[PDB]
Write an enzyme that holds these catalytic residues in place. Structure first.
Site, mmCIF file in Angstrom:
data_model
loop_
_atom_site.group_PDB
_atom_site.id
_atom_site.type_symbol
_atom_site.label_atom_id
_atom_site.label_comp_id
_atom_site.label_asym_id
_atom_site.label_seq_id
_atom_site.Cartn_x
_atom_site.Cartn_y
_atom_site.Cartn_z
ATOM 1 N N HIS A 96 -8.178 3.330 -14.990
ATOM 2 C CA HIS A 96 -7.892 2.189 -14.128
ATOM 3 C C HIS A 96 -9.165 1.503 -13.676
ATOM 4 O O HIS A 96 -9.082 0.537 -12.913
ATOM 5 C CB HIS A 96 -6.990 2.554 -12.941
ATOM 6 C CG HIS A 96 -7.561 3.564 -11.997
ATOM 7 N ND1 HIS A 96 -7.055 4.842 -11.889
ATOM 8 C CD2 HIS A 96 -8.565 3.478 -11.093
ATOM 9 C CE1 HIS A 96 -7.736 5.504 -10.970
ATOM 10 N NE2 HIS A 96 -8.673 4.709 -10.486
ATOM 11 N N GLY B 49 -13.047 4.532 -4.020
ATOM 12 C CA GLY B 49 -14.289 4.761 -4.717
ATOM 13 C C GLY B 49 -14.489 6.181 -5.234
ATOM 14 O O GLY B 49 -15.467 6.444 -5.943
ATOM 15 N N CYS C 56 -12.372 8.031 -7.185
ATOM 16 C CA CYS C 56 -11.751 8.366 -8.451
ATOM 17 C C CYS C 56 -12.839 8.578 -9.500
ATOM 18 O O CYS C 56 -13.929 8.006 -9.427
ATOM 19 C CB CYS C 56 -10.786 7.264 -8.858
ATOM 20 S SG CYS C 56 -9.236 7.218 -7.883
HETATM 21 C C1 YVA Z 1 -9.494 5.975 -6.658
HETATM 22 C C2 YVA Z 1 -9.831 4.489 -6.787
HETATM 23 C C3 YVA Z 1 -11.218 4.203 -7.315
HETATM 24 O O1 YVA Z 1 -12.157 4.899 -7.057
HETATM 25 O O2 YVA Z 1 -11.329 3.066 -8.113
HETATM 26 C C4 YVA Z 1 -11.235 1.900 -7.331
HETATM 27 C C5 YVA Z 1 -12.673 1.547 -6.893
HETATM 28 C C6 YVA Z 1 -8.375 6.004 -5.583
HETATM 29 C C7 YVA Z 1 -8.340 7.279 -4.783
HETATM 30 C C8 YVA Z 1 -7.348 7.038 -3.621
HETATM 31 C C9 YVA Z 1 -7.853 5.971 -2.643
HETATM 32 C C10 YVA Z 1 -7.246 6.399 -1.288
HETATM 33 N N1 YVA Z 1 -7.131 7.839 -1.384
HETATM 34 C C11 YVA Z 1 -7.202 8.257 -2.831
HETATM 35 O O3 YVA Z 1 -7.159 9.376 -3.237
HETATM 36 N N2 YVA Z 1 -7.170 5.777 -6.405
HETATM 37 C C12 YVA Z 1 -6.184 4.760 -6.103
HETATM 38 O O4 YVA Z 1 -6.329 4.073 -5.162
HETATM 39 C C13 YVA Z 1 -5.006 4.662 -7.042
HETATM 40 C C14 YVA Z 1 -5.309 3.661 -8.149
HETATM 41 C C15 YVA Z 1 -4.042 3.608 -9.019
HETATM 42 C C16 YVA Z 1 -4.017 4.760 -10.022
HETATM 43 C C17 YVA Z 1 -4.201 3.317 -10.512
HETATM 44 N N3 YVA Z 1 -3.936 4.144 -6.225
HETATM 45 C C18 YVA Z 1 -3.488 4.958 -5.115
HETATM 46 O O5 YVA Z 1 -3.980 6.033 -4.905
HETATM 47 C C19 YVA Z 1 -2.363 4.413 -4.231
HETATM 48 C C20 YVA Z 1 -1.297 5.162 -4.110
HETATM 49 C C21 YVA Z 1 -0.120 4.736 -3.225
HETATM 50 C C22 YVA Z 1 0.833 3.647 -3.688
HETATM 51 C C23 YVA Z 1 2.009 3.266 -2.791
HETATM 52 C C24 YVA Z 1 2.216 3.958 -1.449
HETATM 53 C C25 YVA Z 1 3.391 3.543 -0.545
HETATM 54 C C26 YVA Z 1 4.302 3.242 0.159
HETATM 55 C C27 YVA Z 1 1.239 5.036 -0.978
HETATM 56 C C28 YVA Z 1 0.065 5.425 -1.873
#
Ligand code: YVA
Ligand code: YVA
Lengths: 305, 305
Positions: A41, A143, A145
């Protein structure tokens, strides 16, 4: 003596962490030999995340759209491929710091260390378990991931987890290093439920062994119990069933302590039905289920790496 | 989101760990530039430790009685000196992996990471607080002495602790890297008392803020309190008094959550008088006091090193 939630030393993994940027999106990658692994992603717009068509998004991406930075040195991307939910970026340089390593898919109940990172830089390390419902109780902000989970054997890093998301309940989901999710999750911004989570009975028992070694012995009892008797009470409290394999895994702790496995089970049955009446176990007022038996042995024998 | 007891990434310290042997006695040393630091009781036999005369024992020892191994390469000792309770061993080659570093004496209530080592190899990493009675609640077996505690500030490793012993109550005691014990302890095998320990009130508050950030907010009440009213209750429960310096340190957390320090103090005052009623906070049935306000900010905002 003493018993702490202990991570592996992270040095070998720190030297593999890089920053990966695509357009507006930056996260972490793992650089091993001439390949950088990261969540697919990275290629997404914030709009795209609601329902990404990853195949079509990747087609719009050339190698030069991927900025990989290791320290302050940009690595040149010379190929890219998508494997399940991970992106593999081929780079023109192999990581001189690549340790001996394996990719493994761990089993529910097993533990690993997480090296949480931001902008390709390590920020901290902690120990997690794969819950029975295939989530982990982590600590991850935006940030993070691309952060990875791992075990270490002597000199070999077993990579088992890469971080991709958080669920509505506040727990975390991710993939193995082949990009296959643990559990029923997909990489998109949507409502996703995890299963009901059970308690890792074999780990609670191992932890009770650790407690005895370390001075907390007040919960030991004169009564004993059978496996079937114990398991009937376990279901009632949402504990995983205990099998003969679990017994055999606990065998070494039983031997080092002279407390038969089914005697500890009898103590756990009584802890479950009557609680702790004001006492604590290894400083906790709740039963702890994120130490495996091997974790307990490693920590109480000083196993090194 | 999520909140975990999180150690610093340990690689910069792993590269300074070496094995130090004198006679039948092997423990860990810390190799910085051309000096190896270790506990002076490396020169003791088992009998010597009931009541060592360290000066006399060191006189019987020569450079060649000190065996230092860095990995599998032997480092030649070319000088030795005692400073308080640490030995300084001058070696013939400087550590190429020496980080930028400082030696600091930490304050009660502050936290640090321990890299627990055996035979000069890392076995694991975990977070400790220096308790108000100058002990730490660690995990140390025989052979672990010379393991170090440290903090990292971007690229700068601040070493604050070297492990020396365990007390009869199961807690641990050690020195700064100049060899001065924290607390009233001596490096001899005798029964030694730590004082009554107290709860690090400012740290509990910081953790309550972390709990709110992460969805555990049931304990918030609409009241406020005075620092004086609050401290009258705290002291009944063996909590450190809260000063205006402590309030100011919590200021930024207050600001990022919109909960005034003294409103959280009102919340904590109720929790102590009414207990938790079988509810939990960040997965704990007890109030946690080993996270500093800085620990909370760093974790809940993603500071990296
Ligand atoms: C990693 C994102 C990253 O580093 O790249 C962007 C710069 C994120 C880790 C999340 C952030 C908050 N806590 C974590 O562990 N990953 C994401 O944000 C995910 C990205 C999607 C996989 C493609 N998205 C989520 O984690 C969101 C989840 C979510 C959706 C809907 C609801 C409701 C209601 C609750 C949580
Ligand atoms: C590390 C010493 C080491 O590695 O030396 C071998 C090369 C030890 C760590 C201890 C071992 C058990 N758990 C630990 O943390 N340190 C020691 O063994 C101390 C050595 C003395 C400083 C010179 N000794 C102790 O820690 C023992 C203390 C003690 C406990 C209980 C009672 C009673 C009653 C009396 C003394």
């Amino acid at each position: 003596s003493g018993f702490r939630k202990m991570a592996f030393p992270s040095g070998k993994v720190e030297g593999c962490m890089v920053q990966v940027t695509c357009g507006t999106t930056t996260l972490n990658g793992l650089w091993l030999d001439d390949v950088v692994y990261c969540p697919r992603h990275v290629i997404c717009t914030s709009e795209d995340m609601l329902n990404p068509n990853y195949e079509d998004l990747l087609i719009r991406k050339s190698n030069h759209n991927f900025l990989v930075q290791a320290g302050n040195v940009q690595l040149r991307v010379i190929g890219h491929s998508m494997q399940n939910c991970v992106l593999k970026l081929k780079v023109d340089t192999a990581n001189p710091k690549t340790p001996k390593y394996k990719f493994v898919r761990i089993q529910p109940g097993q533990t690993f260390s997480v090296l949480a990172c931001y902008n390709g830089s390590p920020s901290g390390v902690y120990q997690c378990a794969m819950r029975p419902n295939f989530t982990i109780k982590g600590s991850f902000l935006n940030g993070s991931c691309g952060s990875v989970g791992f075990n270490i054997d002597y000199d070999c890093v077993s990579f088992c987890y890469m971080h991709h998301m958080e669920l509505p309940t506040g727990v975390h989901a991710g993939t193995d290093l082949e990009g296959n999710f643990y559990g029923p999750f997909v990489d998109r911004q949507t409502a996703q439920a995890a299963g009901t989570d059970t308690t890792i009975t074999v780990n609670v028992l191992a932890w009770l062994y650790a407690a005895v070694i370390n001075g907390d012995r007040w919960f030991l009892n004169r009564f004993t119990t059978t496996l079937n008797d114990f398991n009937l009470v376990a279901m009632k409290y949402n504990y995983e069933p205990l099998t003969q394999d679990h017994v055999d895994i606990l065998g070494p702790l039983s031997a080092q302590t002279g407390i038969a496995v089914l005697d500890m089970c009898a103590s756990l049955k009584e802890l479950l039905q009557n609680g702790m009446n004001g006492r604590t176990i290894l400083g906790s007022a709740l039963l702890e289920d994120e130490f495996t038996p091997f974790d307990v042995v490693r920590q109480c024998s000083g196993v090194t790496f």
